[PDB]
């Protein structure tokens, strides 16, 4: 029913942009916030700004090289660092932007705030947009992500909470938490993606986790545009289920526009109504859930979606119509907030997934400084003037 | 110039590339198994096997010229650019230990393996002696029928995915990263 | 049945290399090699199918570790030695050291590639792309000139003897380290970059106000290059994004042709036949006489393809006029006679056997019957949707919206929708719709959702050929004529269709191909049944 | 009606770009006045270094000693045979003699001697495969770079309808499943009911997206191998064995053939069927009577 949702805004997310003609962009968040208040959500949703992370702040998952890395990240001096660039995966496939030290600091500040408002029980949904990183491995950089911000926000998490859900909704699935998580039996880890010529290509029916970890790792491939109905189709009973066996105290909800009709590698085709109503049923459930954005190479869309993820969050319905902001010029002929779907072809049959779901349950039967550690410490936030 | 290997042991070099190059397989460093113990076992066990008529004596110097070759030969033919840095970590983690690091102590005998494969080129482009060249064919020769009855207790196949000892490790993200990259 | 066993299952796998690697798969278990699970599993794909089979063997053998994937193999411990002194016990026990993840192994050396795009894609990713790095660099610089007027406003009460000695910490006194960097970098030249901000860092108050001022001139001229870029990059949007969203449909001028041929028609239907004989020899001896049945839910239908046929009688010009005449009168008569339509308001069981011409025919106007259905199922939904199209006032204040096609009115506003796609198809078939008009209100009116509707006149021009020959071959004009002796709206079956059958075996010869097409009155249920080669032999 | 001419604006070009407005209108007075690119170690690519008097480029890994960029020697850098061709024992004391007083130093290792003079005469590189060894197994060939490759290892369109796939130009005929009889063609009017279907690398079996686990087709890496043959790994816990095949050997006489007993031959696998790596002729009269009597045999345990 009605619960106070906690939005986390950085008004320096968006002021690194890493590159030009480049598909991962931070820079949606700036019209994510624009349309939060240009949408009057503010009077019934509190706001607070995270602050930026340091050093040792970082080193719960990630080496203390990497750390050292993302401290001293600077483009000038990029023909001497060639042994730690390749060793972390960074300049080759994923270039070198400056003011990284600051996103990655802000991302983590993020993600453990919301983690921590979770535990304390501030809030019953912690939204943090500004941080939703999930490719990023303990000493790797590869998905184009650099901090895998959630590792950090589900141990956060763990220090209060006996068990938290890892989920992941878009293409190129983060199998940086799955990794991280492979052999403990008290985080269980799901992802919706497609495998099959894919970048990232891990992810299979029978990667289920080995040790202590066994068959707590689920992970569903799919196929090249699959609509919205078959989406619903392969949701709502594996999430129901992972609810009645697991039964976790939080949830982590990696929202994103990947998995849109419009992508430049993706392959999906659900509109706003396919990703929005399968939030809305795990949100019905009642239990405490953390949501992060990390994906979308279109950028009006992902911000339309990530708006009406608000506005369904704050137990609203929003108008279709679309007020000025000063993004308005983004948005299509239509000017509305409507993410129209394509015509893709449905290849992913009703029976594969039916096969899917049968080799799910029978593996899902078995189951049945320091100093500013906790966070517990965020700026106030209450005057924004991004309303037009 | 001919020299002759049997299947199995090509088998093991061929398998050996694979896991290299396809599979991603790196030797354990902490074998349980060195190579000096392989040539002393060779040497004890080919004194007391057969009679004493002097063989003892090129015996020992083949043993020794086999040991100095291996140590200054190790990363000269062999060693893949996938181990090259494994081998910079051997000779950085001694250097910190002020300690002058010998491959002998340490390496498996699939590397010595790999040299009496290549052992033919090495031979062909040097300027020899006919009767050294054949003395050193047949003791190779002998050492690989010493590693044919002893094949089933010194090369033992494991799957190091789920064992700790399996004279093979895995390689990591990084190490593909600073190695290929 | 052991001694019947084997001989059962090899008459089912049939290849004789197949049965080599079922035999090699026998000896790894057989040779206490291969453990339970893993028959179990090879059986699984080998005789899943049998249940029966599987049944015996599982009662026969007695069936009732870890599952070790492809990728996350074990890492060594040597690189689990790591001092990290920010993780603590909880950290130790929740995060594993020993597994890792690369994609490169997953490629296996080969690398991967990504999805293919359409050209209208990839200049709306380029355009995006403009947009992004312009906007950013907008918002970037007046950030900083927030900062900038914030320091003023601080220094704008106090005295020379403080302004004199200003020096502060790198970051501004704000929380973020590098934002003045780069958007000074950015602006001004590499090698003064750093020396402007050793000024501004080491002597503030001096050199703020002339970079405020050139920063504010340049957010004013770059606000004033964006608006006059908006007008051009929205319209150029506005006939983009709709070609980025159809797929399919841009691919479908070719597709329509290339899948919908002769050859085509024979595969398809020879291998549903061939499926289910192989389905029901699995299973059971009869088979079904019903395979690829289409529903007729409306009448109206048959009365917009005459509309669109008559509308094309007068519209080709390399026919002669009583050739139209004759082939327009005939396909009036083939719905006047299949369906028991007798009358038509624009006009101003039962077995037939057809060879391939009719039979391609009757398909092609079955997916023609089928296109119509698929729009006029949701045509109730997009009606009431652009009947209240709720205007956004703030975008017409700034003539923001798609006036592309509102100035000869294609918009479907203010009128029925499937009355407009009849009209448009008709004026199409008159040659004179500009393609391109036609599939962007045809995309923007239903969402991009009915692609297959986009080569109507094709569709249309290559029925009218097929309907052609349907006089001019004399076994196709001998068929009709006993159509026309053998339809009598009485109760003649069960003991007629087979001299039917057997005359059109006999006077068609070897090479043609017969069709069953069994129609039923009630409820406007079709059969079509593949009997090519059954009755010759 | 897009103008890229009149519109194009006067600060900004086109973007992933810059221009000289960042160069002229910077004005600020408020400070009041022979080599290669193939690396011939292991044949591959990544940073280099070079000889001032050598052609021959290595890696920073790919020497005796090695080195990293972060402290890397000052002055010229010079590779082993370049100690050995313009400096000692070539230019000054030039190679007599050398090899065998050097044999008389080094206390009588002549067996090995000759090996030992030639790695200080040899440039560091990747340990190569012999010749030799690539006849003797016919099934693995030499990449590009140099890498393992068996046969396990392979060398509108992109969605949409794909009737080619179905149809085989080895006969037209149809490419019926294992798992469910049927090809699955669809129609036209209803692309949805069509599967996506995939033949084998090895037997060419058809087989459907649907029945074993897999979401799409396979077109880079390893050859799509169907779960019906021979696997390379097997697993069965007692620590345990692998038995990693035996990858074929060739037709020549390495291969021997020895059919000599069919109950009991304790053969471990590796067998062909007819109508040292030691193998037997194997029927199929042969396979089911071990198998009746190895589950007659283990029943009762």
Redesign the interface.
């Given at each position: 029913d009605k619960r106070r949702v906690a939005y986390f805004y950085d008004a320096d997310v968006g002021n690194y942009a890493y590159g030009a003609g480049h598909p991962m962009k931070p820079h949606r968040i700036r019209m994510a916030h624009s349309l939060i208040m240009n949408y009057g959500l503010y009077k019934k949703m509190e706001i607070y700004r995270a602050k930026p992370a340091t050093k040792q702040e970082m080193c719960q998952f990630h080496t203390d090289e990497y750390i050292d890395f993302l401290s001293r990240v600077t483009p000038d001096n990029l023909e001497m660092f060639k042994?730690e660039s390749?060793?972390?995966?960074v300049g080759?496939d994923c270039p070198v932007f400056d003011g990284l030290y600051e996103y990655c600091s802000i991302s983590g500040g993020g993600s453990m705030e919301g983690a921590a408002r979770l535990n304390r029980g501030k809030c019953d949904v912690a939204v943090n947009y500004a941080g939703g990183l999930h490719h990023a491995?303990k000493?790797?950089a590869?998905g184009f992500c650099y901090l895998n911000d959630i590792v950090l926000g589900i141990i956060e998490l763990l220090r209060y909470h006996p068990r938290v859900l890892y989920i992941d909704i878009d293409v190129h699935h983060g199998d940086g938490v799955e990794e991280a998580f492979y052999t403990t039996d008290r985080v269980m880890t799901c992802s919706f993606h497609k495998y099959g010529e894919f970048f990232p290509g891990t992810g299979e029916l029978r990667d289920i986790g080995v040790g202590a970890g066994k068959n707590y790792a689920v992970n569903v491939p799919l196929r090249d545009g699959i609509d919205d109905a078959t989406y619903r189709s392969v949701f709502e009973p594996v999430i129901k289920k992972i609810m009645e066996w697991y039964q976790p105290s939080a949830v982590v909800l990696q929202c994103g526009g990947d998995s849109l009709s419009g992508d430049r590698l993706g392959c999906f085709n659900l509109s706003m109504e396919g990703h929005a109503n399968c939030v809305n049923y795990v949100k019905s459930f009642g239990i405490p859930m953390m949501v992060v954005g990390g994906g979308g190479y279109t950028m009006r869309n992902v911000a339309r979606t990530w708006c009406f993820e608000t506005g369904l969050l704050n137990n609203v319905v929003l108008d279709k119509d679309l007020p000025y902001n000063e993004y308005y010029e983004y948005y299509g002929p239509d000017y509305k907030l409507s993410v129209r779907p394509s015509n893709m072809f449905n290849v992913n049959t009703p029976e594969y997934l039916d096969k899917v779901m049968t080799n799910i349950f029978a593996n899902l039967e078995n189951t049945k400084v320091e100093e500013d550690s906790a966070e517990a410490k965020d700026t106030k936030g209450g005057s924004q003037y991004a309303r037009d | 110039i001919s020299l002759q290997?049997?299947?199995?042991l090509?088998?093991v070099?061929?398998?050996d590339?694979?896991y290299?190059?396809?599979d991603?397989k790196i030797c354990?460093?902490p074998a349980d198994v060195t190579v000096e113990m392989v040539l002393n076992k060779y040497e004890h066990e080919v004194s007391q096997e057969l009679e004493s008529p002097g063989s003892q004596s090129?015996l020992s110097?083949?043993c020794?010229?086999?040991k100095?070759?291996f140590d200054?030969?190790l990363?000269?033919?062999?060693?893949?650019?996938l181990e090259?840095?494994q081998?910079?970590e051997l000779?950085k983690k001694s250097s910190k230990d002020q300690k002058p690091l010998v491959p002998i102590r340490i390496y498996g005998a699939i590397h010595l393996l790999?040299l009496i494969?290549?052992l033919?080129?090495?031979?062909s482009?040097?300027?020899?002696d006919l009767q050294?060249c054949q003395?050193?064919i047949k003791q190779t020769e002998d050492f690989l029928v010493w590693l044919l009855m002893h094949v089933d207790e010194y090369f033992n196949?494991?799957?190091?995915?789920?064992?700790?000892d399996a004279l093979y490790?895995?390689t990591?993200?990084?190490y593909?990263?600073?190695?290929?990259? | 049945e052991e001694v019947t066993f084997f001989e059962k299952a090899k008459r089912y796998i049939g290849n004789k290399h197949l049965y080599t690697e079922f035999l090699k798969i026998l000896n790894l278990y057989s040779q206490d090699i291969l453990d339970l699970d893993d028959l179990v599993e090879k059986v699984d794909f080998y005789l899943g199918s049998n249940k029966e089979l599987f049944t015996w063997f599982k009662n026969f053998v007695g069936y009732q570790c870890?599952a070790?994937g492809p990728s996350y193999?074990?890492?060594?411990?040597?690189?689990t030695f790591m001092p990290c002194s920010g993780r603590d016990d909880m950290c130790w026990e929740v995060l594993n050291d020993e597994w890792?993840?690369?994609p490169?192994?997953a490629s296996?050396?080969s690398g991967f590639i990504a999805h293919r795009k359409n050209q209208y894609e990839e200049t709306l990713f380029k355009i995006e792309e403009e947009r992004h790095e312009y906007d950013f660099y907008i918002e970037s610089n007046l950030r900083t000139i927030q900062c900038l007027e914030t320091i003023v406003n601080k220094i704008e009460n106090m005295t020379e003897n403080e302004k004199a000695n200003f020096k502060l910490p790198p970051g501004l006194g704000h929380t973020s380290m590098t934002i003045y960097k780069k958007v000074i970098r950015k602006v001004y030249d590499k090698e003064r970059g750093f020396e402007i901000i050793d000024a501004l860092h080491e002597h503030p108050a001096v050199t703020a106000p002339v970079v405020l001022k050139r920063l504010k001139q340049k957010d004013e001229e770059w606000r004033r290059a964006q608006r006059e870029w908006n007008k051009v990059w929205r319209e150029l949007e506005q006939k983009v994004f709709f070609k980025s969203l159809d797929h399919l449909g841009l691919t479908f001028k070719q597709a329509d042709k290339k899948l919908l041929t002769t050859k085509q028609l024979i595969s398809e239907i020879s291998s549903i036949k061939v499926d289910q004989t192989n389905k029901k020899i699995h299973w059971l001896t009869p088979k079904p006489k019903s395979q690829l049945d289409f529903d007729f839910p409306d009448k109206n239908i048959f009365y917009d393809i005459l509309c669109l046929a008559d509308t094309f009688i007068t519209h080709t010009t390399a026919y002669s006029n009583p050739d139209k005449e004759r082939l327009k009168d005939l396909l009036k008569y083939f719905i006047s006679l299949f369906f028991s339509i007798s009358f038509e308001k624009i006009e101003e069981i039962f077995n037939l056997f057809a060879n391939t011409n009719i039979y391609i025919f009757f398909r092609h106007w079955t997916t023609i019957y089928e296109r119509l259905l698929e729009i006029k199922q949701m045509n109730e939904r997009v009606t009431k949707e652009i009947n209240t199209r709720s205007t956004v006032t703030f975008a017409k204040d700034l003539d923001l919206l798609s006036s592309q096609l509102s100035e000869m009115g294609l918009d479907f506003v203010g009128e029925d929708a499937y009355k407009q796609v009849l009209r448009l198809s008709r004026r199409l078939i008159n040659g004179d719709l500009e393609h391109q008009w036609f599939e962007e209100s045809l995309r923007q009116a239903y969402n991009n959702k009915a692609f297959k509707l986009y080569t109507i006149d094709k569709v249309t021009q290559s029925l009218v050929k097929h309907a052609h020959t349907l006089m001019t071959d004399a076994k196709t004009a001998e068929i009709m004529a006993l159509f026309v002796k053998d339809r009598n709206a009485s109760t003649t079956s069960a003991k007629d269709q087979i001299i039917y059958r057997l005359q059109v075996r006999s006077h068609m010869s070897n090479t043609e191909n017969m069709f069953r097409i069994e129609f039923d009155k009630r409820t406007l249920h079709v059969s079509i049944q593949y009997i090519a080669l059954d009755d010759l032999t | 009606k897009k103008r890229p001419k009149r519109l194009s604006s006067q600060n900004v070009n086109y973007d992933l770009k810059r221009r000289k407005i960042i160069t002229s209108e910077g004005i600020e007075r408020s400070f009041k006045n022979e080599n290669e690119d193939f690396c011939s170690?292991?044949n591959?690519s990544?940073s280099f270094l070079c000889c001032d008097t050598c052609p021959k480029s290595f890696?920073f890994?790919?020497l005796?000693p090695?080195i990293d960029p972060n402290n890397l020697p000052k002055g010229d850098w010079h590779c082993?045979e370049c100690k050995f061709k313009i400096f000692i024992n070539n230019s000054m004391a030039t190679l007599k003699k050398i090899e065998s007083n050097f044999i008389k130093q080094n206390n009588?290792?002549?067996?090995?001697?000759?090996?030992?003079?030639?790695?200080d005469s040899?440039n560091?590189?990747?340990?190569?495969?012999?010749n030799?060894?690539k006849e003797?197994?016919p099934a693995?060939k030499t990449?590009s770079r140099?890498?393992?490759?068996?046969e396990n290892?392979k060398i509108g369109q992109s969605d949409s309808y794909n009737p080619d796939t179905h149809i085989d130009s080895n006969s037209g005929k149809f490419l019926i499943c294992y798992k469910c009889n049927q090809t699955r063609l669809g129609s036209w009017s209803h692309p949805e009911n069509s599967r996506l279907i995939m033949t084998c690398d090895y037997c060419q079996t058809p087989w459907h997206l649907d029945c074993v686990p897999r979401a799409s087709f396979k077109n880079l890496g390893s050859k799509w191998k169907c779960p019906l043959h021979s696997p390379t790994?097997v697993?069965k816990k007692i620590?345990?064995?692998?038995?990693?095949k035996?990858?074929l050997?060739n037709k020549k006489n390495?291969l021997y053939y020895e059919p000599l007993q069919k109950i009991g031959y304790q053969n471990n696998g590796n067998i062909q069927i007819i109508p040292?790596?030691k193998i037997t002729q194997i029927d199929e009269n042969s396979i089911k009577y071990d198998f009746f009597d190895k589950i007659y045999k283990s029943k009762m345990v």
């Open positions: 042994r390749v060793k972390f995966n080759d491995k000493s790797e590869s | 290997i049997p299947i199995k090509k088998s070099l061929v398998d590339w694979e290299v190059t396809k991603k354990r460093l090129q110097e083949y020794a010229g086999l100095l070759y200054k030969c990363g000269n033919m062999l060693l893949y650019r090259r840095l081998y910079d000779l790999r494969s290549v033919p080129e090495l031979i482009s040097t300027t020899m050294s003395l050193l196949d494991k799957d190091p995915n789920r064992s700790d490790v895995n990591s993200s990084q593909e990263g600073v190695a290929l990259g | 870890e070790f193999k074990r890492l060594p411990k040597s690189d890792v993840g690369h490169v192994w296996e050396d | 170690a292991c591959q990544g890696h890994l790919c005796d090695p082993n009588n290792v002549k067996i090995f001697a000759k090996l030992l003079f030639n790695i040899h560091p590189k990747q340990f190569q495969l012999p030799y060894i003797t197994f693995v990449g140099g890498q393992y490759s068996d290892d790994k697993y620590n345990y064995k692998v038995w990693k035996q990858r050997i390495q040292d790596f």
